[PDB]
From Swiss-Prot:
Residues carrying Phosphoserine: 50, 242-243
Record note on what altering residue 50 to A/D does: No phosphorylation
UniProt source species: Homo sapiens (Human)
Biological process terms in GO annotation: actin cytoskeleton organization; cellular response to angiotensin; cellular response to fibroblast growth factor stimulus; cellular response to hypoxia; cellular response to nerve growth factor stimulus; cellular response to nitric oxide; cellular response to platelet-derived growth factor stimulus; cellular response to unfolded protein
UniProt name for this protein: Tyrosine-protein phosphatase non-receptor type 1
UniProt keyword Ion transport, yes or no: no
EC number(s) stated in the UniProt entry for this protein: 3.1.3.48
Cysteine sulfenic acid (-SOH): residues carrying this PTM: 215
Record text on subunit structure and interactions: Interacts with EPHA3 (phosphorylated); dephosphorylates EPHA3 and may regulate its trafficking and function. Interacts with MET. Interacts with NCK1.
Subcellular location: Endoplasmic reticulum membrane
Domain of life: Eukaryota
Binding locations of substrate: 181, 215-221, 262
Length: 282
């Protein structure tokens, strides 16, 4: 693979930091005026990125439509993703409101609730079938339906009920539980298997609203998930798979939200994931 030739070249000359820095320099800058309004201060996770105004998800509410979430719309790949922050103690209702309004089928969580001895997001889903969650502010009920714990990820079936209409939807919660506290995984194998499990569920498919993806504040992961998924899809779609340039795809995604890949090591890992994923697929 041409991408693998490039990978080996970057590795040999040790230019990951340089490549990464060039992408950072070239990355889009758009306003986040709404995110920065004083009334939204408590809706933003500290140390997390802000959503661009142009691509932010709006809650269907008259009072305050703000949530820290962005729609990444990949035109050529025909994939969309919503990237959002880990829910805060006071934005869990907003989070599930977004899932409801956007008709998402899946939520992809790429962090543990506690990492490095610190809380990374609110416990925003119920942990026991018999202890459902009611979000009074957005009038939603959330029930754990089933939970399947595997070595590298957990998948949960949740039932989300709009208490206003009594309509219910099944949401799949895909929780990658083994991303290390520091650095990146040594091998992309489990992360790729996880992505394939999300794909197989239909959560990324066009019949549903965009998958909602989140991780921990300011440290990426979510971008790697979407970047890998889109690159692999494009390799299956294009007449010339070798023309798929991860840097170009990343820059395209970066038009929709900042902080997709946060370190040079994450950039390297993303290459590694696409390379290994491509070998598995084609
Ligand atoms: Mg029990």
């Amino acid at each position: 693979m041409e991408m693998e030739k490039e990978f080996e070249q970057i590795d040999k000359s040790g230019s990951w930091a340089a490549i990464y820095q060039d992408i950072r320099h070239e990355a889009s800058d758009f306003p986040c005026r709404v995110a920065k309004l004083p009334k939204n201060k408590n809706r933003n996770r500290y140390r997390d990125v802000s959503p661009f105004d142009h691509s932010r998800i709006k809650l269907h509410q008259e009072d305050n439509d703000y949530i820290n979430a962005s729609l990444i719309k990949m035109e050529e790949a025909q994939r969309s993703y919503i990237l959002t922050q880990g829910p805060l103690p006071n934005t869990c209702g907003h989070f599930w409101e977004m899932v409801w309004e956007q008709k998402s089928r899946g939520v992809v969580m790429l962090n543990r609730v506690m990492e490095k001895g610190s809380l990374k997001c609110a416990q925003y889903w119920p942990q026991k079938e018999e202890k459902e969650m009611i979000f009074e502010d957005t009038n939603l009920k959330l029930t754990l339906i089933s939970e399947d714990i595997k070595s590298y990820y957990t998948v949960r079936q949740l039932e989300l009920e709009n208490l206003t209409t009594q309509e219910t939807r099944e949401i799949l919660h895909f929780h990658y539980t083994t991303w290390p506290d520091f650095g990146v995984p040594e091998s992309p194998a489990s992360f790729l298997n996880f992505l394939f499990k999300v794909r197989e569920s239909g959560s990324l498919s066009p019949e549903h609203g965009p998958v909602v993806v989140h991780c921990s504040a300011g440290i990426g992961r979510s971008g790697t998930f979407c970047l890998a998924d889109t690159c692999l899809l494009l390799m299956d779609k294009r007449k010339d798979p070798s023309s798929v340039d991860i840097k170009k795809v990343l820059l395209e995604m970066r038009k929709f939200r900042m902080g997709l890949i946060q370190t040079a090591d994450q950039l390297r890992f993303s290459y590694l994931a696409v390379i290994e994923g491509a070998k598995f697929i084609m």
